[PDB]
Design a protein around this ligand. Structure first.
Ligand SMILES: Cc1cc2nc3c(=O)[nH]c(=O)nc-3n(C[C@H](O)[C@H](O)[C@H](O)COP(=O)(O)OP(=O)(O)OC[C@H]3O[C@@H](n4cnc5c(N)ncnc54)[C@H](O)[C@@H]3O)c2cc1C
Length: 451
């Protein structure tokens, strides 16, 4: 139990009641350092640990697709926590009011949360801090190396983050102890879900048909399903991962991101299991570079760049280049709605958007293509960011995520990239031509599937 995984958010005066884990990003009972640390604090204080989760007011900014995925996972999590004699409380409202009142009503001794560098989580933390008098910690349960330990600063390139992260893997890549049950046992989510779906229904994504776009059978939610997705990746897809990760016609990615986003599975767990797997070495190297380096550099980016969703966080070479080309005439301009409906003149863009609409998980390779075309066919880089973020967060099951803001910033602003050949409109931002994709994979086949 490495104390570098835990950080103080606010000093206070310990109470004598239960330890409260305010669960937010890591919605799982296994392999969860935030829950493990909370249990350990509780054991030392001779009190139970309890879990609280806030069903916030912001759910109406995404769709049923994410809400159902999350809540069905939480239904399973209730069962799992209760088998460990750990009660769970689902508070309807936003954390400032609800966590502060829970702490008071339940005489909590200590408050622990998990770690997210996103602005909304920090907004919540500030409001909670002002409503409590007990000590308040956070634990990095999402990264193998705690974000504030991996580097002291924003890293401008994967090649400067990678050696720092790997220098720390021998220390921090380690097995998880079993979660000790509590010593004794100290509105349903279904009804919550029904109420939420009712509120979301008018904005559900539909065909002109009125038939719903989303297909909810591609990724079944919850901890158990996540483990099966991990196991089938290692058994059936990891060998081919190195060769096929950039081919969106093949179903050869891990498909773990929706689970990783909600923390229904630990990336540290996935890494442990992949490390021990015997597969082609280039495949393992490639996969670990995505789930370790690119995933954790995305937390690095959001943690150290308050303006991570804005033009100002782009590297200076990219800001200067995009500025130099700000007044270039765009070959096309599309509205948010035209992008959203897949109604551009580019059939590969449209098919990428259709994959997002129907499955909630656009292939990683075409996400790069897609965001770069939003840059190319919008009035400014600032507008491009807004559109890409809006669509990514509204329709990706894995959205509203540091990987999203960092991936969009990479695509549009060259964050964690270098200058390439100068073009009009897009300046030196890496370009991803349609023709280049055709040389790379069977574009026609991808278009046929998603049209
Ligand atoms: C414009 C754009 C937007 C993106 N938005 C998101 C988002 O909202 N949420 C999200 O989780 N990922 C996002 N990504 C990163 C990446 O596209 C997805 O993580 C990946 O496609 C998810 O599929 P998978 O789990 O099957 O991937 P795999 O290839 O199996 O990768 C395994 C895991 O590694 C991590 N990973 C892989 N690629 C990246 C990457 N480029 N950056 C960061 N972490 C990575 C993810 O945790 C992923 O689940 C975005 C990328 C771009 C270019």
């Amino acid at each position: 139990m490495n104390p570098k995984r835990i950080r103080a958010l606010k000093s206070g005066k310990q109470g004598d009641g239960p330890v409260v884990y305010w669960m937010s990003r890591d919605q799982r009972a296994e392999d969860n350092w935030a829950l493990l640390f909370s249990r350990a604090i509780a054991k030392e204080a001779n009190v139970p640990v309890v879990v609280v989760f806030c069903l916030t007011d912001e759910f109406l900014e995404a769709g049923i697709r994410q809400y159902e995925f999350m809540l069905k996972g939480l239904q399973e999590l209730e069962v799992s926590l209760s088998r460990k004699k750990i009660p769970s409380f689902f508070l309807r409202g936003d954390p400032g009011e609800k966590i502060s009142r829970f702490v008071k009503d339940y005489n909590a001794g200590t408050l622990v949360t998990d770690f997210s560098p996103l602005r909304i989580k920090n907004q919540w933390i500030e409001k909670v801090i002002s409503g409590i008098s007990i000590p308040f910690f956070e634990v990095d349960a999402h990264n193998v190396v705690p974000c504030w330990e991996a580097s002291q600063k924003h890293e401008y390139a994967a090649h400067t983050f990678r050696p720092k992260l790997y220098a720390l893997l021998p220390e921090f890549l380690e097995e998880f102890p079993e979660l000790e049950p509590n010593s004794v046992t100290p509105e349903t989510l279904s009804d919550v879900l029904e109420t939420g779906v009712k509120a979301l229904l008018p904005e559900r994504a539909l065909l002109k048909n009125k038939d719903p776009l989303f297909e909810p059978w591609h990724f079944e939610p919850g901890e158990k399903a996540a483990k099966k997705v991990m196991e089938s990746f290692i058994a059936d897809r990891l060998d081919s991962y190195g060769a096929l990760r950039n081919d969106p016609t093949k179903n050869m990615l891990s498909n773990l991101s929706p689970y990783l986003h909600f923390g229904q599975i630990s990336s540290q767990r996935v890494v442990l299991e992949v490390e021990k797997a015997e597969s082609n070495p280039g495949s393992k190297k490639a996969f670990l570079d995505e789930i370790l380096i690119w995933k954790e550099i995305s937390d690095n980016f959001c943690y150290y760049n308050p303006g991570y969703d804005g033009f100002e966080s782009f590297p200076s070479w990219a800001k200067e280049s995009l500025n130099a080309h700000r007044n270039d005439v765009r070959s096309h301009i599309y509205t948010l709605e035209e992008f959203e409906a897949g109604k551009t003149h580019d059939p590969l863009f449209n098919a990428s958007q259709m994959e997002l609409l129907s499955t909630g998980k656009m292939h990683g390779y075409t996400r790069m293509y897609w965001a770069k075309k939003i840059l190319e066919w919008s009035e400014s880089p600032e507008k491009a960011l807004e559109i890409a973020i809006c669509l990514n967060d509204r329709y990706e099951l894995d959205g509203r995520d540091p990987n999203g803001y960092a991936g969009i910033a990479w695509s549009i602003g060259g964050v964690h990239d270098r200058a390439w050949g100068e073009r009009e409109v897009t300046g030196k931002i890496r370009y991803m031509s349609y023709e280049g994709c055709k040389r790379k994979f069977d574009v026609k086949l991808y278009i046929e599937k998603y049209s």
